[PDB]
Amino acid sequence: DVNTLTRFVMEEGRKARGTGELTQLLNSLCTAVKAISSAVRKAGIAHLYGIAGSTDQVKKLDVLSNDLVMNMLKSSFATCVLVSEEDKHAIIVEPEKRGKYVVCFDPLDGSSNIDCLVSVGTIFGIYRKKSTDEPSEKDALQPGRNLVAAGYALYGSATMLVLAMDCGVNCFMLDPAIGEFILVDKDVKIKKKGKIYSLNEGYAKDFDPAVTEYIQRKKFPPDNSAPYGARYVGSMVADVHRTLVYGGIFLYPANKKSPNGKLRLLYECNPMAYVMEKAGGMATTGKEAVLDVIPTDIHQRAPVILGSPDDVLEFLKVYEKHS
Amino acid sequence: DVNTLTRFVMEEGRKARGTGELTQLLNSLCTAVKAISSAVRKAGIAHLYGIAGSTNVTGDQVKKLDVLSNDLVMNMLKSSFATCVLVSEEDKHAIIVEPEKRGKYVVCFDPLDGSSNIDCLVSVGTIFGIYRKKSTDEPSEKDALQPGRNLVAAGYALYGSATMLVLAMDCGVNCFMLDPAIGEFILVDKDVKIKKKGKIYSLNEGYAKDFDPAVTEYIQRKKFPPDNSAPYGARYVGSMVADVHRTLVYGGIFLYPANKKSPNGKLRLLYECNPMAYVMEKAGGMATTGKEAVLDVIPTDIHQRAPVILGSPDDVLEFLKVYEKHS
Amino acid sequence: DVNTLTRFVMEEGRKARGTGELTQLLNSLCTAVKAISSAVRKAGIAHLYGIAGSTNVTGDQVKKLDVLSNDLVMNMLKSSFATCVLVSEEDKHAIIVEPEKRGKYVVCFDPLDGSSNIDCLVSVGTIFGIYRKKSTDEPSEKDALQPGRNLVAAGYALYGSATMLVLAMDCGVNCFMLDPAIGEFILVDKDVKIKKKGKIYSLNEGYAKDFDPAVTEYIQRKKFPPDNSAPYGARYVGSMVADVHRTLVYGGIFLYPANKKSPNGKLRLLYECNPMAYVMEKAGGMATTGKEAVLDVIPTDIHQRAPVILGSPDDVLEFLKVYEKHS
Amino acid sequence: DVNTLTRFVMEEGRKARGTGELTQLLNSLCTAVKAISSAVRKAGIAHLYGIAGSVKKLDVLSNDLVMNMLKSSFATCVLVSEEDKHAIIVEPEKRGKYVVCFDPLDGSSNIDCLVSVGTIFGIYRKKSTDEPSEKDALQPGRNLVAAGYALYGSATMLVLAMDCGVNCFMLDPAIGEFILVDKDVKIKKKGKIYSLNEGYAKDFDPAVTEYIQRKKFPPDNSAPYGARYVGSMVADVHRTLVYGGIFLYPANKKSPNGKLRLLYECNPMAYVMEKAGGMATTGKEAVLDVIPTDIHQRAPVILGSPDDVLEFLKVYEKHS
Numbered sequence A: 001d002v003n004t005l006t007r008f009v010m011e012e013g014r015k016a017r018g019t020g021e022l023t024q025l026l027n028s029l030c031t032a033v034k035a036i037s038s039a040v041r042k043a044g045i046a047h048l049y050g051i052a053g054s055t056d057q058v059k060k061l062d063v064l065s066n067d068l069v070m071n072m073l074k075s076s077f078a079t080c081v082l083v084s085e086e087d088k089h090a091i092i093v094e095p096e097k098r099g100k101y102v103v104c105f106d107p108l109d110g111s112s113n114i115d116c117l118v119s120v121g122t123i124f125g126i127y128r129k130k131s132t133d134e135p136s137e138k139d140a141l142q143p144g145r146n147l148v149a150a151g152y153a154l155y156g157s158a159t160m161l162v163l164a165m166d167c168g169v170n171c172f173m174l175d176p177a178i179g180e181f182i183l184v185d186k187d188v189k190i191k192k193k194g195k196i197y198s199l200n201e202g203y204a205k206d207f208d209p210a211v212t213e214y215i216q217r218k219k220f221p222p223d224n225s226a227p228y229g230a231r232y233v234g235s236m237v238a239d240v241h242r243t244l245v246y247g248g249i250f251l252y253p254a255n256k257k258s259p260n261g262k263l264r265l266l267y268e269c270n271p272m273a274y275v276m277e278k279a280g281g282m283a284t285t286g287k288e289a290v291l292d293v294i295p296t297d298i299h300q301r302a303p304v305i306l307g308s309p310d311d312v313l314e315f316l317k318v319y320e321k322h323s
Numbered sequence B, C: 001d002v003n004t005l006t007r008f009v010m011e012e013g014r015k016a017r018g019t020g021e022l023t024q025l026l027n028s029l030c031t032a033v034k035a036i037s038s039a040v041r042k043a044g045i046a047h048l049y050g051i052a053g054s055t056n057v058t059g060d061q062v063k064k065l066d067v068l069s070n071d072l073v074m075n076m077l078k079s080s081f082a083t084c085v086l087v088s089e090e091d092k093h094a095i096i097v098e099p100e101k102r103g104k105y106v107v108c109f110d111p112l113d114g115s116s117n118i119d120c121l122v123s124v125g126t127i128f129g130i131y132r133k134k135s136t137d138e139p140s141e142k143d144a145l146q147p148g149r150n151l152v153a154a155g156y157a158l159y160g161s162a163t164m165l166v167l168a169m170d171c172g173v174n175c176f177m178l179d180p181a182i183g184e185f186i187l188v189d190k191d192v193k194i195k196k197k198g199k200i201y202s203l204n205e206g207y208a209k210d211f212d213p214a215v216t217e218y219i220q221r222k223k224f225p226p227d228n229s230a231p232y233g234a235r236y237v238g239s240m241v242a243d244v245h246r247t248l249v250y251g252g253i254f255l256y257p258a259n260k261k262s263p264n265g266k267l268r269l270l271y272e273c274n275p276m277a278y279v280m281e282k283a284g285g286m287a288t289t290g291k292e293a294v295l296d297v298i299p300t301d302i303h304q305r306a307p308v309i310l311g312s313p314d315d316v317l318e319f320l321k322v323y324e325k326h327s
Numbered sequence D: 001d002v003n004t005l006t007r008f009v010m011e012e013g014r015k016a017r018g019t020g021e022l023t024q025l026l027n028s029l030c031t032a033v034k035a036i037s038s039a040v041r042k043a044g045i046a047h048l049y050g051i052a053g054s055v056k057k058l059d060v061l062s063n064d065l066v067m068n069m070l071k072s073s074f075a076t077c078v079l080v081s082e083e084d085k086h087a088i089i090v091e092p093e094k095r096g097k098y099v100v101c102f103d104p105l106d107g108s109s110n111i112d113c114l115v116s117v118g119t120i121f122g123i124y125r126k127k128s129t130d131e132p133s134e135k136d137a138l139q140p141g142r143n144l145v146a147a148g149y150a151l152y153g154s155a156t157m158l159v160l161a162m163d164c165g166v167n168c169f170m171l172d173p174a175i176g177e178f179i180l181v182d183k184d185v186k187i188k189k190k191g192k193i194y195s196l197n198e199g200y201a202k203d204f205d206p207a208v209t210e211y212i213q214r215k216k217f218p219p220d221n222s223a224p225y226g227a228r229y230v231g232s233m234v235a236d237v238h239r240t241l242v243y244g245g246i247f248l249y250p251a252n253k254k255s256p257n258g259k260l261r262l263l264y265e266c267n268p269m270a271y272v273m274e275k276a277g278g279m280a281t282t283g284k285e286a287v288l289d290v291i292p293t294d295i296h297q298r299a300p301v302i303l304g305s306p307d308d309v310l311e312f313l314k315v316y317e318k319h320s
């Protein structure tokens, strides 16, 4: 039977005995992702270039993508606190539209390389508000282990939405002819070990000796097996999704321009770690599992190594050797 | 004033006082590219997954996409009445256009690179180079054995976050953005030029163990600059259109160089290296094999390989300085 | 606050304390309508005309729209797990859903009304009525033989200059515009109500020689008002969905009455007249056979015909008074 | 062998040995019509209704699209639009030699009910050697170089009439391309449908009343014609071209010289009809022979299958 995101989400919520609040939230997020995809593919750009007589582009697209997510989630009546990469402070939903959920998201990740039309993407993570206090930024400071749902949209050669919940990881392809996300890979599981590593090797000078050693073993295998292939798009959604689909390992470790890491814990690392763990993968900072870091600031950064468990375990063995 | 690919091509054809044959070829290629973009973005995939009660998925969808893209380009170019010989990355032999539809142009193309890149849903591209048939002999694969310098037009379409067509001709490089709401390529970057020195290098460092000693030293110098300037950034998508386009837009260097086990490189000269070398040189960049300019190689086989290092001229010259140090 | 069909239907389901079954049905219908819309606007027609050669067509692609439409609606409703008995203009007998997929609802629909003249690009449409199952026993086509009064939901999609879904339920009539750029039905008109009296009449006057004398007199009053008021304008698209939507939007009257060669009219009671009558009544309009309300007829055959006169209430009342005068 | 509008137009230009100017004009109209279609189908309406938190009328937008695309083609010198009281004169730097008269969005009267709407165009070559003026648009339809319409119905079709005949192109929205689907089109000799607003029955000339009576009670007592009246000229005329038959907008008392406009409604449709082997008459003469004195002047029109038009004229000549 054909399955769609709308039907899949409605049926999981029926199975969950819930009230429909999270269903309405995920419904609203789907709409926003379809509207982001349309703009990312440049529908209507002819009007910007004067087709009807009327005459920062990358910037405005991430602002618009933020507005679409913010508006769709607000009017869902399902949220109370929204944290966005585009916004310095947490947004507090007005009282008459408040619901039970906190949403952390990057509405257009990798946006700043739109000039090259590289893949861009959306990342989101959904929490049940935990405190009974008046809503505030504190409600978003929960460890990733508390995630109820998380995932991402990739605006690549096609638009795909990956949604991770308690039930596992499911991938949906957008059919632009009808505006429906079609279920195409069910209960995805990452392979135990891959043949691809992904990281910005331009920071090789700043690399920890654990990282340098691990990556040396991927290029020059001490057992003389085949070297791993390398890929790095520089957009987290593209690089993590390739790791999910093919296996392997993605690293963005600390460097001396980013001693706490480059990626952001709340709306980049935590959602991707959650998808990885639900897929049978791993996600570590080196010191602890990403999902166990307790945030103290909503835009704080973390180092991340994630992907196939044998590859992450192999990295972690090299890491404790450098204790 | 807004400009479209169709209007731009038509006006350049008028300025050239051509017969209109090349214009028709490029109109045909543009339609084909719009058709590939629609398939790449997965229009109608709901019907494949049973929305109307029918079909299983069966086989290799990525392969079928490459084949479908090849059939779109082949058929639009055949029906243009502007071509006689078609060389495609997807076909063993050159396709000879039937007598009734023969025109004067030779087209080498790679219609899509889905199968040759395990990256899934990250970018895909089409590359093309257009030559004028040089002899009046009955058409054969020999008519595509021309050096890249003989190209009249070349370029690529990138199916990325948006669909972009880059077209290079004697008038320079121009970049057109596909507006899917209306099926028009909108002119967005005019007479593009690459910057003389960039800050990004692009190659597959998994192959590091098989690197020629000069590639190792060059890359080491990008990661550990001897003058303690800032290291270059690294990006490697695995799709030639994507990696070359970023080099064009941001500057820097892209390398798929020769080495011991692959003494002629891996990429193909006629429909990968030559069109990109032409775009680079028209943009004021460089494209070398290490031994010579890509566009000066005279091919002897239609699927022959070439090493290629291309991009900002100061970076390519710096690599050639290191390459000659190890001669 | 923006509102979509998905969000609207979901909240209404939460309001009425449903189990979500109707909601999944309506979600399924929405998806089929989107796919029908895409086919009607001729997405992919270029493959039918050989853009990729002869080999690249046949699947859902080669089916006529009436067949494709039936397959889309049939399949989406079956896979909704919310229906048990389906009635379509396309199939002589009601379809009994497999027990593994059965829900509690009965759906009567016309997958593509007006496809008659889809050749001239006239607006066409989809019509649907939803009943709950009443019977103690195994689902059978007698479950669909309910009066229009038992409807829980009804409406139509119009594929005209734009695609619109008109949904009628207990809460009233609501209208959703399909945004093709993102594939969402946007709530654009809420709790819609017909005007009390219109200035347009709508019927096929070409068959005037066979008109019932009561229809002859009522049409004459429209064109030759006995009080020197302004005569009504005439519109007849020949596609029921388009004519009924204009009647809802602009007011007036639409007639497909009984004549003498056609004892009970031509339009079908279950999946043409009944849904349209339900929309009209929820909008403060009217719909009669001449002798009783359409929604009161007790059907005995799932494909039985019914005369229909519907629209603004003062216009249907004037017709009835002329009609009862001749009875 | 598939063909597109772009490739068909360019190939006809090559055969004509034209300089490319009219081909650029027609390319430019093709783009405008694709953009009108996109807006008519309501792409982007979600933004109007606040999907991102926070408006030109369709007819205004459509006029802007055609006007700007034609101006920027460098192929035109005088543009007459139903939306503009005076003719637009193109600035010297963007001037070509063609005069274009058009209705950017006919039927938008009642777009509130999502009826079919259309764009109609007629293209003339400027004869004079002098400065372009409104007078250059005052030509009989006989002088047309090209005419047609785009119908935004259940699907979008462009019908183009030229010397070479009538050709029909279907817009494939997946790829944004007009595909040639019906070639060298000819209308049926006689149809079975008549199209007019019978709400004006009280004002009909007795020729029209008697002709309509012939359609409902046939004198050879064949089957009565069916009736259709969409109320959008493009939709009713296109059905007439596809199925044969007759379409009439005759004189009534709020429109004593007809309601439809000669330069950009009647003349383009008359020219499609004639190139398809049909006819179009005011009743007194061929539409294409009327010499206009006002760019917005109205004309009565009866057009369609040749046998049905001749039959009307035979009834008309009786009441002469």
Ligand SMILES: Nc1ncnc2c1ncn2[C@@H]1O[C@H](COP(=O)(O)O)[C@@H](O)[C@H]1O
Residues within 6 Å of the ligand: A009, A010, A011, A012, A013, A014, A016, A017, A018, A019, A020, A021, A022, A023, A026, A100, A128, A148, A165
């Ligand atoms: N559509 C859904 N998919 C998966 N889980 C759900 C869904 N709806 C509700 N749940 C679960 O039920 C809980 C309460 O749902 P709600 O009543 O919608 O807030 C959520 O926090 C989830 O754990």
Ligand SMILES: Nc1ncnc2c1ncn2[C@@H]1O[C@H](COP(=O)(O)O)[C@@H](O)[C@H]1O
Residues within 6 Å of the ligand: B009, B010, B011, B012, B013, B014, B016, B017, B018, B019, B020, B021, B022, B023, B104, B132, B152, B169
């Ligand atoms: N649309 C065009 N853009 C750029 N150059 C063109 C174009 N059309 C023709 N030319 C040039 O004129 C030559 C002959 O034109 P043709 O008669 O179309 O083959 C071509 O090989 C090009 O060098």
Ligand SMILES: Nc1ncnc2c1ncn2[C@@H]1O[C@H](COP(=O)(O)O)[C@@H](O)[C@H]1O
Residues within 6 Å of the ligand: C009, C010, C011, C012, C013, C014, C016, C017, C018, C019, C020, C021, C022, C023, C104, C132, C152, C169
């Ligand atoms: N989405 C909805 N909109 C309006 N009424 C509904 C909806 N869902 C359920 N209902 C009402 O509640 C009944 C039971 O719903 P269900 O259990 O989903 O079949 C239906 O037959 C309707 O009367």
Ligand SMILES: Nc1ncnc2c1ncn2[C@@H]1O[C@H](COP(=O)(O)O)[C@@H](O)[C@H]1O
Residues within 6 Å of the ligand: D009, D010, D012, D013, D014, D016, D017, D018, D019, D020, D021, D022, D023, D026, D125, D145, D162
């Ligand atoms: N694309 C075309 N299709 C049909 N006829 C054309 C075309 N281009 C030119 N012609 C004919 O040749 C004349 C001169 O064209 P031009 O030099 O473009 O003004 C026109 O007025 C038409 O009669």
Ligand SMILES: [Mg+2]
Residues within 6 Å of the ligand: A062, A085, A086, A106, A107, A108, A109, A110, A111
């Ligand atoms: Mg961002």
Ligand SMILES: [Mg+2]
Residues within 6 Å of the ligand: B066, B089, B090, B110, B111, B112, B113, B114, B116
């Ligand atoms: Mg290939």
Ligand SMILES: [Mg+2]
Residues within 6 Å of the ligand: C089, C110, C112, C113, C114, C272
């Ligand atoms: Mg029907």
Ligand SMILES: [Mg+2]
Residues within 6 Å of the ligand: D082, D103, D105, D106, D107, D265
């Ligand atoms: Mg008009």
